[PDB]
Design an enzyme around this catalytic site. Structure first.
Site: not given
Ligand SMILES: [Cl-]
Ligand SMILES: [Cl-]
Ligand SMILES: [Cl-]
Ligand SMILES: [Cl-]
Ligand SMILES: [K+]
Ligand code: NA
Length: 274
Positions: A36-37, A99-100, A159, A250
Site C-alpha cells: 500500500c505504497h 521495506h517492511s 510507525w 518505521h
Molecule cells: Cl509492508
C-alpha cells in the site's frame, strides 16, 4: 524525480516502475516497496544511489500515483512481476533491498532467482518475530471493511512512534492517502498468511535452499527484547547480520537515507569483489 517513472505491460497488468537507466557496473539495486505504497517511499534513497548505481523500483499491482482495484494476489505474484520487469530491462545480477513486508517478496525473490543472480539482500525494518497481540490486532482491523481505516491509523501511530517527523508524515497522510480497502485488506490477508505458513521472516530466511549474506537494518521496535532475537539469530547464522540505525520512525528509507545507503554500498562493493 518523475523522469525515471516508466510504465510497462506485465502479463495482464500495467505496472509502473522507476529506472534511472544508469549505464554502469553491476549489480543493479532493486528497491522493493512494501504494501500500500509506491516508489515515492524511496525518493530520498534513490537520490543517494542515483549517480553510482542503476536503481530499479517496481510498483506492485494496483499501486502507483493512481491506485486501482485489481484481482487478488500475494507475494508469489510480486516476485514474478519483479522478475518479468528485470527480464524486459535485460538486467542480470541485482542487489534487492526491501521495506517492511516487501521482505516476503525479497526472500522468495532470493529463492527463485538464486545466489548467482541475487547473491545478497538487505531487508529494512521488518518485524522478525511472529505477530504480537498489538500487531495481530492491527491485521484483524485491516481486513475488516468497517474498520480498515481505523486500522491504518493505528499503524501510522506505531510507525511514527510519537515523532512529528515532517517527511514520514507526508508519506503516510498524502502519498498513501489514495490507497483504499482493496490494498489494505489485501495486505492484511497476505501478511497474516505469510507468517502462518512460513512461521516468520527468520524461519523463511533460514529455510532457504541456498542461504547467503542478508542484513537486517532497522529503527524499530526500539526495545532491548527485539535486538536480542536479532543478535541471537545472528549468533546462530554466519550469513545473517543487522544494524540498529536509531532513526525516529518505521521508514529508514525516508528519515535516515544516508545511513541506508551506507549499508547498501557496503553490500554492493562486497559483490563487486567476487
Ligand atoms: Cl509492508
Ligand atoms: Cl510487534
Ligand atoms: Cl501490516
Ligand atoms: Cl557474495
Ligand atoms: K553472523
Ligand atoms: Na506524529
Amino acid at each position: 524525480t518523475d523522469t525515471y517513472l516508466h510504465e510497462t505491460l506485465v502479463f495482464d497488468n500495467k505496472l509502473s516502475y522507476i529506472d534511472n537507466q544508469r549505464d554502469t557496473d553491476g549489480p543493479a539495486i532493486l528497491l522493493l516497496p512494501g504494501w500500500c505504497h509506491d516508489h515515492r517511499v524511496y525518493k530520498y534513497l534513490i537520490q543517494e544511489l542515483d549517480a553510482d548505481f542503476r536503481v530499479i523500483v517496481p510498483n506492485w499491482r494496483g499501486h502507483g500515483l493512481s491506485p486501482s482495484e485489481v484481482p487478488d494476489f500475494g507475494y508469489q505474484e510480486q516476485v514474478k512481476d519483479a522478475l518479468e520487469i528485470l527480464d524486459q530491462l535485460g538486467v542480470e545480477t541485482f542487489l534487492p533491498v526491501s521495506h517492511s513486508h516487501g521482505g516476503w517478496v525479497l526472500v522468495e525473490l532470493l529463492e527463485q532467482a538464486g545466489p548467482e543472480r541475487a547473491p545478497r539482500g538487505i531487508i529494512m525494518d521488518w518485524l522478525m518475530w511472529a505477530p504480537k497481540p498489538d500487531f495481530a490486532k492491527s491485521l484483524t482491523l485491516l481486513k475488516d471493511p468497517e474498520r480498515w481505516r481505523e486500522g491504518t491509523h493505528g499503524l501510522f501511530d506505531v510507525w511514527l512512534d510519537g515523532h512529528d517527523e515532517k517527511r514520514v508524515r507526508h508519506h503516510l497522510l498524502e502519498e498513501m492517502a489514495d490507497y483504499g480497502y482493496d490494498c489494505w485488506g489485501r495486505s492484511g490477508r497476505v501478511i497474516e498468511d505469510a507468517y502462518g505458513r512460513n512461521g516468520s521472516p527468520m524461519q523463511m530466511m533460514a529455510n532457504l535452499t541456498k542461504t547467503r549474506p542478508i542484513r537486517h537494518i532497522f529503527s524499530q521496535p526500539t526495545e532491548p527484547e527485539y535486538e536480542k532475537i536479532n543478535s541471537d539469530f545472528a549468533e546462530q547464522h554466519p550469513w545473517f547480520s543487522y544494524a540498529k540505525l536509531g532513526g525516529p520512525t518505521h521508514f529508514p528509507a525516508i528519515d535516515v537515507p544516508d545511513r541506508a545507503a551506507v549499508h547498501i554500498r557496503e553490500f554492493a562493493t562486497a559483490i563487486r569483489q567476487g
